[PDB]
Symmetry: C4
Subunit: 258 residues, 4 copies
């Protein structure tokens, strides 16, 4: 329900909403569909019972109530009235409620899926540490990916487990006018990544953690994304292939030493 190995409390139900809002839009509707079917049968197989018959329609039996059902659960009432007997009515009433209620939770999950924040921030499969305007400085570079932003990013660091406050891999600029961002930080004394070697990190399970946060002007939702680099991912003495006016994005991740 989380990131590497969990044993805690859970409950089918919620786990379900999860899928509801994480699945693809066809797999979604299919999901309903499949449920529509299952929910149309269970009511049909509850019609061929009772104190009297139902399917006063074209279909002889079952296939009647079914196509009857698919006229009430969804509440379309088409026009072949089977309000013939009480038991018969009840069932049909119990249905009407449901489907009406069902349409809700569906129209419901729908909006809930729409509401999923909509922008996404993509980060460089690889970090890099190079010499810059003087001293040694680290670098990570991310960028928008659909409906822009204009964010601020904090940048934390993990070794040993103590999570050290690294001058925000923004250390130079905590924010920016995002439509191409190159987050970076000087490794001078002040910094905790001082005298530390690729060998130094490696042993401390060292991790570079970054999170950009910005609001989507289009929906004003403030959506934040995070990203983690494993020590062996910080590729040394390199740089990012230039990308640009226009930016072309294919080679975003690659690097080359210096």
């Amino acid at each position: 329900r989380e990131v590497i190995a969990y044993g805690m409390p859970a409950s089918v139900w919620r786990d379900l909403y999860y899928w509801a809002l994480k699945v693809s839009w066809p797999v979604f509707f299919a999901s309903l569909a499949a449920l529509f079917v299952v929910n149309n049968t269970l009511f049909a197989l509850l019609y061929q019972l009772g104190d009297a018959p139902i399917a006063n329609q074209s279909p002889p039996g079952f296939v009647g109530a079914f196509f009857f059902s698919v006229e009430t659960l969804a509440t379309v009432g088409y026009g072949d009235m089977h309000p013939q007997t009480v038991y018969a009515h009840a069932i049909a009433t119990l249905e009407i409620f449901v489907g009406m209620s069902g349409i809700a939770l569906s129209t419901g999950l729908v909006f809930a899926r729409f509401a999923r924040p909509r922008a996404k921030i993509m980060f460089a499969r690889h970090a890099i540490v190079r010499p810059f305007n003087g001293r040694m400085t680290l670098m990570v570079r991310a960028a928008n990916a659909r409906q822009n932003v204009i964010a601020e990013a904090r940048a934390k660091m993990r070794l040993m487990l103590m999570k050290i406050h690294d001058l925000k891999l923004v250390r130079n600029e905590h924010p920016i006018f995002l439509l191409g961002w190159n987050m970076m930080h000087v490794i001078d004394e002040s910094s905790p990544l001082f005298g530390e070697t690729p060998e130094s990190l490696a042993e401390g399970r060292a991790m570079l953690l970054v999170m950009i946060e910005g609001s989507d002007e289009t929906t004003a939702q403030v959506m934040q994304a995070r990203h983690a680099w494993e020590h062996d991912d910080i590729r040394w003495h390199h740089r990012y292939v230039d990308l640009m006016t226009h930016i072309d994005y294919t080679r975003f991740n690659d690097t080359e030493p210096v």
Copy 2:
């Protein structure tokens, strides 16, 4: 409507929405159901009146309009037209509006319940004060519980009533990359929990108050949770049983002295 003894202004109505969005999902739908019924009768008992009859259907009387009603309030129109007389029509029109409108407020409360933030932060039934990397420091440890976060926590303290600003039981890190958080604070001079003994607190109704706040990347809602420790809950000279790679929360709360 609040925490220990209130006497103030109020108004039924809202108090209701409350329940709407705090009750269990069956108790919910039942609620509607029950209301559906009540709302189907009141319209039926408004049919057996007027200038003319209604139930031109299977049911002789009442049980007719009812099962008629449950064809309009929900708006299913099935197919036994009782638009026979004016008065008869009106009633049926007044209905149609309603139910149509009713379905709304229901589909409505629904989304409003979905929208309830969805993550929850769980805290250690017990605080703890132990020696760490040198001096005496307090500790509380909380963790996610369904759809993660990545929050910041302030930590306040109560004795006596003056609520003292304790260097955020985050004093070391006001935030973190939450998926296991261990909030803690050094008790040196600067700190207000300095020279204070289990006996010292006890008399001041001393309380440890903590609140983590973070946004759910999945819905971007910023949901905060709080938690209070009673002085006799801060268990001294202990530590938290280790929990981890994997974390097994089963033993999240336990501790063992040092």
Copy 3:
């Protein structure tokens, strides 16, 4: 559309949503109702036209299409089919779309009204300036009013027009565990309300401006409220009648000199 005298750009439409989400819930539904009617007529009076008749129902003429209409706009289809002629169909189709669409915007405004933040912060009709634990200090006191919070408040000040940064009428505590809050600030040198008399303010159109901001744990919406005091409202050398365990709220605003 704003607070004392405006002349700018506007547009009926939006001004309308305004009312939609500011009116009372009956005035609301009435609003629709009234619109339902108006929207049922305009379609009826568009039926008694065309290439052929419509009202093949109980009502002789008009009152027929109407009660017909109120069977389609809302989309209930009851059961007296007037799909007799093309023109006749069209009209009925144009309708079906609408009402279906209309039900939307209605179910729509509905949720939009629900979504109105739900907590409200009430402030003391009167500020007060009294001597406290030593020096002269100002004071304002607000409190919840339905579904609590736990907020932080900034406090600004206006004279001359320059809006001076007054050590947040929280100057002592920028936040609190809100369920009765008494915001206050020392008037020592540091403070801009230093040597200033009721006569001093009065001439500078002096204003005390306050805003509390907190999140509603129940909906996680962060709702802020503001409040302004006119110089002659800061009542001097007084205090707030005590109010309290339980708080009883009737005399919240009153004061008495010292």
Copy 4:
């Protein structure tokens, strides 16, 4: 999909929601309408097929199923039952689902459009730099434009590309009680716009960038707006025509030297 020249990954679908929530409200509904039509045909042209006929209604052929269709997709069930044959039923069932589902995504996009933040911040077509209370200071002035706020604004500056941290064109007040805001900043040493002339900027493609951010108390959405001034837009040695008690925005933009 962005601001000057892009070449990157994408996918129709989302690009669509975009339009959904950016188009005008008629162009909207038209959009649906047009789709209603297209979606009514494709089902009709799927009726004149199968193992048996359909249009047992007024219209001889096609125009029958169509007006039939427009009775089910929308789910109105009017009353000329064509549940005559299986194939015939299926088609009609496949429809019912859809339209029911379709109404959702529509009621859906609807709320999603409503939810578009609703306030907007307007800025002075022209900046200005004048002498104030002593030294030379810059100035920009913005103001609400429908449902107020109460925001905080950061103010950045561009020359050359290095984006210099200018003491927030709020440098005097980072916030305010917005209902007329006049953002300004002293140009002393500390400031990066020090000794720089209209000629100095011009060559560095100099840009004044501002962004106000505040929450709409009415919906608690925090909506931010931005605005950029081209160096030749900062009009020197001027001021803003006064606007006020009442403010008449008609003359919001104008200025006059000093």
